[model samples]
Target: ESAWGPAATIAARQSATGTKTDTPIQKVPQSISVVTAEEMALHQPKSVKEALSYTPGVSVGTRGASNTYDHLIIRGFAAEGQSQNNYLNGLKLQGNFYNDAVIDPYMLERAEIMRGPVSVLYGKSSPGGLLNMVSKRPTTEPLKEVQFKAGTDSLFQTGFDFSDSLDDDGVYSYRLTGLARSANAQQKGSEEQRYAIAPAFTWRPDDKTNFTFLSYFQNEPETGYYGWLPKEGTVEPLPNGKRLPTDFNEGAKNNTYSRNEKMVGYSFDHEFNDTFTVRQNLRFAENKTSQNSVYGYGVCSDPANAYSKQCAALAPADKGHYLARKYVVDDEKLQNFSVDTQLQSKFATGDIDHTLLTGVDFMRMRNDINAWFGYDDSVPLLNLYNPSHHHHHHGSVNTDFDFNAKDPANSGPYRILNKQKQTGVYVQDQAQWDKVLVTLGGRYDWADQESLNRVAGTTDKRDDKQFTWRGGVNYLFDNGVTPYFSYSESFEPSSQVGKDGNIFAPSKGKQYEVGVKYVPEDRPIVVTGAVYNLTKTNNLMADPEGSFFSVEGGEIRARGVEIEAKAALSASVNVVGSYTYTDAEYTTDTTYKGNTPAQVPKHMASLWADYTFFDGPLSGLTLGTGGRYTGSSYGDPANSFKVGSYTVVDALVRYDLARVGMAGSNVALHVNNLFDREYVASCFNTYGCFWGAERQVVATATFRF
Candidate 1:
């Protein structure tokens, strides 16, 4: 089928991430996860982090609740930040921060996560893998809905989704979706306001040709706090065994963060014959952001003594009052353009069947940022335990000096401009014979990146080209079971330069994966289990040649096992379960060899189930429950400090109003972190610790027509 329809069950069996073409999960020799729109609605996710929390081989909330970016760690590797491996509708999304490529779950039809190296098809990606989000396209059938929601922290929201055919013959269709919300953040004294709209249209004059256009705009006047707490009093309890309050806000009310973005794209497909087809995808985007914050400098171990530096570096007073703060302001502008075109051929020769695809993609991006980090001794210190009020500082207040500025006298603010371009060509073949399925693919990519230090009048340029390949084989059994083995490689361009002033070679990664997928005909369930060893080489490290630069000789290794199951046992029962074990370590660095990464936990597991009453007087009632457990993890590369393990519970209930004569209406309620247990979510070596979310409740009423 060339077109998509509603999923038959919560468990998905077909995906395009592993291969650019739709393939059965049982045949793809890779670890993959899919979260459908129905699942997202059931979870009521506020971000991608929340939506992927239950999946195996993944870690979310590592940057804390206050961080606006969708921080994710896949297989113990950073997937966010400069990696920027996220995609929208199968196209690369560019930007380092929230404003550049933040996605609203409401506009998504489904999210697909490919858990190992996939650079054979998607070029220049992290070894951990990539996540591709499928947008909600104009449907062939009419659909309309409106929803109202209210939740904890003074949250209120309204949204609508409508789609219908524009003609009697259904030759054209259109969809309009929008949402608006205003809410206080999980952090105290912080608020957030957001609005977004999406309009899409499709033209299908015949079965052989189709074209669709998608466009969207979103704005966020404020993002929540960038949570950062000291390691001592937060992760490790005070001498009295008491921890810092979960509601602690290190930033003042005057701090600000905002994101504005708009995007437009189109997809075209033409089938000239049964054995040949062509398709193209194109998009252009612009993202902008402005941010200001008063962040914590360090813990004040002693507050009573006014020795200045001494008072700002020690513990708290009897009532706790001395701390240091630094003010920072940053403005960024980002623009991106991308296009992908492909030709597909399906044919058979002798006893073998083949599906071949060839494609080329190009991407260009430009990012500019103006930033200032300032410190003012005149600013009052905070009271860690009993602060009277927050300070009122605006803009950058570096009255003392510029720490990272190129010129000390003119260092109030500095600017950086970066431009990136990538071009890639790839080919793949999927062949099947008897019970054996084999896939082979390869790609060649050329990447160019340039950086300009506008403030210092210096420039750095780099260009690199690499070839990546992938091969996999699978055996299908008569009992709905498939076992497979695969090998894949990945590469990434480094921004660092060697002591010789030449750009370092690109980092290369390799992985070996073996997995089995089971979809028994006797049960309505899908189960998968896999183990993989992933390694990265050619990473940049400190240079012995000069104190000014780095060299490329670092290596890191990540190995893990994952098991997951999704079951729709009956009309009333649905369940999802997962367990993961990861051990990621530095393999080549002399100082950190064999040391575990900071956020890679040894164990993690989760399970969720939902039951609905489908008949009798109790009909239309549903109840859902779930729990997650995260094992303790090291906080530093040396493993001297640790972050404790924690568990969280969640519950949900829903009732259909249609059962009581009010057709097309329903009400639902959710309780997250039901126990309200306080614990450290994660910690970083330089930024310190952060706490998990507290107990919160949400309620919603939805109507469809």
Candidate 2:
């Protein structure tokens, strides 16, 4: 019974994310981490961001535990918001930039994080990096599994994976996976409900041709959103000696965020003789979401005039008691179509062996949004000191509210439609000798964007074209050591307009990296270290003359060092550790020059180790412990306010029921934030601050076949 096979091991060896080719990690010439499904299963991460919490050079929880999306910062650059740097399989997850896809952990086989600029191969991406998630596919071997889990906060989850060949000839294979879950969210009055199903099929009729189809549908009814509190008590305590409540849910009880999506895609491969091969990948996805919520504006002024129509200018009435708020409703639709085709050939030019790859890809996305927003004066201001739940009394007390606002006016409903299309052609060549490797790649992209103000009957269009390239070299040593250096470029179209009412040129990023990898022969340990300098230019900046809205001459620089180690010390022990230091600052800007960016921690480190007893009475028993530390950072770009640093602990225990005559069964218990520490997760200026999770405990039982 090989229930736990090679894929269930904690090892980082080969990854395809770095070069878009399946190459050994040591030879990729970049910093990347491949997290295996076994590690994810052991820790039971609820989201993709949570799964990478311990990875070096990666930061999560920028918006706190209440956020439903994976808002992250990698190498001093934000990956969420307008930069949704996440991909599925090998293609970018396209659609509305703000509406990120929430992929289920159970549906993923593995995840890879490639740090630094990657637009040479993947166009229109963040300078920070990108996330590549590999989905579970049909396997040659038969696999069947069923799991049941129950934990604190009224959590219950059930899922199963089934795969097998349709015939004994091994020409046809099929797989089906599904899951259903209901759980309490971090915020009060919020609960999560999810259902998903995936079906896949593969055909290998001959040795030269292979094709596979993959599709999935998911429905999430209770997705969580924001939990922002004021900076006074959450990030910095009040001068009067008072702290904010950790469990306070600032969002309205009736507020809701839900998503329903469907995706269908296919992959085809054909070996046209031994020297050349061709492949094609395509996917079409559609997502619909509805969000209704009330958000905090600021502290309202006490004993104030309610006749004013402008709610944004209101001030707090008391030092720690009153908060101004607003209500918002959004209905959005996103549709995406993308395809990639590639040709690869192995040939020799003189004495050099060259592996050349040429590809062309295209993507089209459309987004539609209808939203309503305003301050409701009928509702009372929030009593922060002793908050009470009342729907009618939820608005600001000192500001005028628009209860019946419609149309794109001040505090009114608005409609918008945006369409974007991008096409890219790229060529890459990898030349190898007896002991040295050289890689070179280049790409050209053309992008077009159009926006329609449905409410105002206005339209705007922008078109841009750019070229990016990459070059790298690495030498393999006999002592199992590899050192490499690489240079890459990235560019993202800027929608910001200058004073002349013309769109700015695309913002660009450049990077220079040097790294070393050490993998001792006959040892189960891997070590990697890297140092790099990255810079971004043409950032939107406030206009000094006040004639136009903004200009594009801002610059930011980020330099960092990272070291990571993974080892299976013994048959019973496995450990993972990492350390990272980043110095990020604005190099050119009139307002925030030489200041740190919000949520860019200067230092981070973490370690996790698990020990299992393989023999004797303690057999089938395992224990694990880990901790993560994040350094303090400024709350705003001006570096005016500071957010304190904090550390969190975790522990886990598991036992195989086989020891007690229950074959194919296991039980496990896990605890996060073991000591229940309280700390600020992230902050934006003085008004917006978020808190980290207090503590969470979960237990699970699994039965396999």
Candidate 3:
């Protein structure tokens, strides 16, 4: 089968995410990696983020233990509190930091990681890049499969995928995918419970018209864990010369997290003629979430708190052993709508074949939040070396003050609605002559934002517009070696306000990249190597003149080298390897100038190889293993302390049931963090360190027809 075939394989030849056009990935002039279904089946990642662990230029686990958010940092730029970095089927995942959407790995056909700025095609983006997920659509052939899995932490899950043609004429087809899971978190007293379903229908009555209806519903009544920890006992030992246990729970046992999300969309394609085809995609999504938890803070007198008095005033009753804490409640409802319509024109002008694309897309969201955040005296300080999970209660420990009451210091009775809308029009053309290829694109966007601070009885509105573009050139040789150079730009509307009570200017991003891609005609293999210099300006910096607010800083730069390879060394042997080196630092800023961003390791690499036996007693059996290395990095912008580097190992063992006279069945064992290494997922600051993932052992049984 070809690399793009449905058969199990890790090598992919084409990707639409690189250009929004179904172009050969080797010629797209950008670095992108695809996680195939076969790869996922082998590794059995429980979340979408875990599926990309081996992909270059991507980092996960920012918030760490049991966080369903899948916080990420790509190429060093991390969007601290938003879900804007994730795109579903080419559209952004619209939601706030507290209330966001989660995609089920079981329902995904594949996931693509596109590196560097892509604002020319996708508007309002982070300079780090984006994750585009492809959903499993209706299959042309019959597909029936069921999966059951159980593992450590009391984990249990079951899912099935069923697809078939509804009519004998082969014009109508439908597919359904669903899953249910229950798992305990690494953190004490926390667990995860999720139920999800996805359904798709396709209609293709003729050669010119094709349309697919896609939708999914997910309900997570228990979302693992939500929390934070002080720097005292985790990264640094407490004054008592003892450290906190890794499973210590700063969050209350009464913690509550419930999120429900639903999305409905359609992809339509019509070929007007050989020269032109028009495509339209539309989706409407709604997300509702409510989370209440008690998280931690640093000891008021800790030396680490000297620089910033974020932990000031309140003294720890027993030196560094006791720490301050707070409680929070968040209830948010988000509605999102997006639509994109584009025309693809394929023609030749004077011997140069051209594929021209012009499109206009619009996205809008409305989010309503009812929440409270506070530090109350009733919630006593926690013991650093010894923690208690039952001190505070939900709703409130406050007697007179409503946990959601009106107190700026404690921050309660907050009610607000935030609305954002953006529209963009873009045009691109890819021209090929003999072996030389060229691509040029341009886009213009208009964005509007509004915030209603009901508690403060204030309304703020901001409107902005900008133009972004991309240009690239490459040479395709007969041996399937392609070297390319590309330049792109990106812009984002600032969420921060200045001392004048006006929104800051939109940030601007620019990048210059050069890369080489090799995809041999006779082999199922892919290799890519690239280096880029990217910079984003107008990001907020500390006010130099004591305005008590932030000012747009000059810029930050990220220069990195990345190499990746996916190949089937033999029909029974497959391998994947990747390496990345990133130097991300502030070129200009008031507070953190020249400092590397926190949590962005300078180096990352991974390698995995799997082999299957087709003969002898070992027939139908497979074994695989991989190692992941992340270099040490500063835990905070101050560069005060570094998080130590670490490497983890993962292994897989599988046996086809055919070896036991049972056809169409298989059982596999997957082990992650096999050594049970104890570590923390880098930190936002000293006061917010988070624990990393624990060792997991999952045994899976699957049956297919």
Name the regions of candidate 3 deviating beyond 4 angstroms: 1-11, 80-82, 302-317, 376-378, 387-411
Point out where model 2 deviates above 4 Å.
1-11, 79-81, 301-320, 375-380, 387-410, 546-548, 658-664
RMSD of 1: 4.6
Model 3 TM: 0.94
What TM-score would you give candidate 2 relative to the actual structure? 0.93
TM-score-based ranking, best first?
A: 3, 2, 1
lDDT of each: 0.78, 0.78, 0.82
Q: Write the per-residue lDDT of candidate 1 for residues 1-705, one digit (tens) a residue.
A: 000112334246878878888787887878988888888888887887778777899887677666477657888876424455788877888775434567888988888888878889988888887888887889888889998999998879999999999897778999998999888876666788889999999999998988889888999998777746766557865444454577777776667788888999988899999899998889999999997776665455522223445354544442133455666678898999999899988999787889898999899999998887554342345645442123111121222322333343322665889898999999999899878889999999988999998988989999889899999998878697889999999998887667677768888889999989896655667889999999988766555545767667888999999999887766688888799999898888745678888977999999998888877987888888999989988876677688988889999998877887777678889998999888888887523678788788989988888
Clashes of each: 7, 7, 1
Alpha-carbon shift of residue 59 in model 2 (angstroms): 0.4
Query: Where does candidate 1 clash, by residue pair?
Result: 300-314, 300-315, 301-314, 301-315, 302-314, 302-315, 321-383
Instruction: Name the weakest run of 10 consecutive residues (lDDT summed) in model 3.
Output: 392-401
**What order do you get sorting by lDDT, best first?**
3, 1, 2
Candidate 3 at 493: error in angstroms?
A: 0.5
What tens-digit string does per-residue lDDT give for candidate 2 at 577-636? 799899998998867888989888899889988888887888988888898888898887
